[PDB]
Ligand binder design. Structure first.
Ligand SMILES: CCCCC/C=C\C/C=C\C/C=C\C/C=C\CCCC(=O)O
Ligand SMILES: CCCCC/C=C\C/C=C\C/C=C\C/C=C\CCCC(=O)O
Ligand SMILES: CCCCC/C=C\C/C=C\C/C=C\C/C=C\CCCC(=O)O
Ligand SMILES: CCCCC/C=C\C/C=C\C/C=C\C/C=C\CCCC(=O)O
Lengths: 168, 168, 168, 168, 168
């Protein structure tokens, strides 16, 4: 690439993997969102919580793809595996899965940051810092808060309804 | 002091002690507020209730320091001891501690007022009356109301959630 | 903590110490501010300069406490020692003490950043960079400028008056 | 008086004396104000400072006369003695005289308050508290601040000019 | 050049030299400006005075380059020598250097105008008259005024502070 400078092939490849992770996460949240839109689940607040996350994750992927091109790396797309579940159980089950999911994204972010440090790629580090690292931390704190409130509320049916009505 | 008039050394010293009490109270509410901001406590309404109180108590201290200077007394600051607890338990536990705290502030206000009467310091008395005495009484009534409602709600997890959602 | 990830116990403890440092600094500026509000000192511009700093330092502490919770660390509060002085002398004396104070805060920030690097905690590093490091540098430059102007003006009484009137 | 209730003849008489004191003070400030308006004194800021005080003192007298009538006391006016000086010297001289003056007013206020306590006249006490006591304290603090700044500035001619230009 | 008409090679070359002079002047003012922004100099008004001049001189150069092209002359750029000093001393020192600098620019303008007369180039003369000659005269008068006021003020530290505060 005529523009490529200080951009290691290792980071380039890891960015492509992270794109796949973010699109996988988006797909997972799409599935979560529509599960809670089921007539036999019917928790609209939960559906909107996860649909908004699907969108955030997709935008994460796009931001990465844009940066990939800005550095002169080459996007390589791979198959996107389907979410790990077809049905997601209670709001509690779903929020637990989501936080596991976010932690895995966060760890991939940290790994990519470590890679960038090792490759002495300060632009990559700045990029991760500005658009991802604090985002993840805040999201995970939020999910932690929700988990705690969901769990305080478990009259399990009553609790699930109230959480969706009054928090989500 | 060129401006000092009818301001006893006893009141001056007691005002300095009260400043320390108010800053101690502010510190206590800071600790309360951030405890409820913990991901494993997660009661945002409670966190905001106590953070607002931290701010009120700090402003109380400042009002006292300003009056101290207006009378030609000399501010003397002392170490501020840390709050009595590191973790504050339930909203009920926390509100009980807060009302104990406010009662102690109120008693210090009353003591200072008695001192002012004994020292025949009508400016001090007016000052306490305008900016503190009714404030405390109203705050303590509010905390009393909350305690009663919190207690009515003890499904303890459910009650704590509902109180935070619908009152705080 | 359910949310805690890549947050070392060393950083957690150092963040708690830094909170104590920032609250100590806030307390010091409170004392500075009210000293200059004394009828026998009477430099309103200086009083407002330091009172605004007290507020900035308190907000620094709060930002740290919020981040502590966001990472799943646990706030631990300690006694706050009283400021190093009861009276602060001239504006020059006071500004010299303030810059010593800011340098000590800045050094604690740098130490904490070094700790974060050693612990490979990129979120911590981003956090310090966004909300503290440049803030300190700018504040210290400002105090440096003031010190130089104060010193140019030492007709010491005249100089102190003019600085407060025309700069502060 | 058909309306008179709990209003002692002692307080009534003391209110009349205080009216005379306030009108005397107003007259003194009138003299101060116009002295600084002299072509050979020419300190417009000082002239306006004292003219505004003349007006405040006159309004104090009126407030007292209104209260006198509200309680069913009878205003009795006496000769108003001329101010203690015909020329007031420097701004420093003038501000020193003013603070002596305000202290004497404040002491008369305190005496009247003590009288009211002894006579168990809570309306009188409330009246003094709302409209005079804090007013005096604030004014005296202000004059204290000015005295300190004036004195810091004593290049006596230069200092007097700068104070008037930059503070008054 | 297809457009070149009545534009002597002598004027063309002299315009290129004048561009170098104006860029040199801009560089000198950049250095002046940032010197006064030093924490140990700290005269913000002086810094802004010289930074604005740096910008004016750069725009002078650009205006000349534009005219060069409008006449069908060819811009030829040369090395720009660094300013004559690294540190500029007092405001007085700096303003003296600036006026020497402006006089040298003005003389180069006059020389170029004389050249234009000799070459019977009325467009060049009009150009210098409209955009430079009166500009220089006004700037030099301004610097003359400042020099006189700076010098009246030499309590050298006090004077330098007051000039920056009240004139610049
Ligand atoms: C502007 C609103 C966007 C809302 C997006 C919400 C959820 C996204 C759901 C699934 C995305 C996962 C895989 C789809 C593959 C590519 C998406 C195209 C990018 C886009 O479509 O941009
Ligand atoms: C919103 C205005 C804030 C102005 C603050 C200015 C000065 C703060 C002075 C002292 C603070 C130092 C110790 C007090 C302990 C806790 C403060 C409560 C937090 C808050 O009170 O938030
Ligand atoms: C509405 C503007 C009032 C400005 C007053 C400023 C200075 C007052 C000066 C002298 C007053 C002292 C004795 C005069 C006696 C009675 C004043 C009439 C009440 C009034 O005149 O009300
Ligand atoms: C629009 C704001 C302009 C502010 C300019 C202020 C100072 C200029 C400082 C140094 C210029 C001297 C040499 C630089 C060489 C070419 C400048 C590019 C022209 C431009 O940069 O135009």
């Amino acid at each position: 690439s005529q523009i490529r400078q200080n951009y290691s092939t290792e980071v380039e490849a890891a960015v492509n993997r992270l794109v796949n992770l973010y699109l996988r996460a988006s797909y997972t949240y799409l599935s979560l969102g529509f599960y809670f839109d089921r007539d036999d689940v019917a928790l609209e607040g939960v559906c909107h919580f996860f649909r908004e996350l699907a969108e955030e994750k997709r935008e994460g992927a796009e931001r990465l793809l844009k940066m990939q091109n800005q550095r002169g790396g080459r996007a390589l797309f791979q198959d996107l595996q389907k979410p790990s579940q077809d049905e997601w159980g209670t709001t509690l089950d779903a929020m637990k899965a989501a936080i596991v999911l976010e932690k895995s994204l966060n760890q991939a972010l940290l790994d990519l940051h470590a890679l960038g440090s090792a490759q002495a790629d300060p632009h990559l580090c700045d990029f991760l810092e500005s658009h991802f690292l604090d985002e993840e931390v805040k999201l995970i704190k939020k999910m932690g808060d929700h988990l705690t409130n969901i769990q305080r509320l478990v009259q399990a049916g009553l609790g699930e309804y109230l959480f969706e009505r009054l928090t989500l």
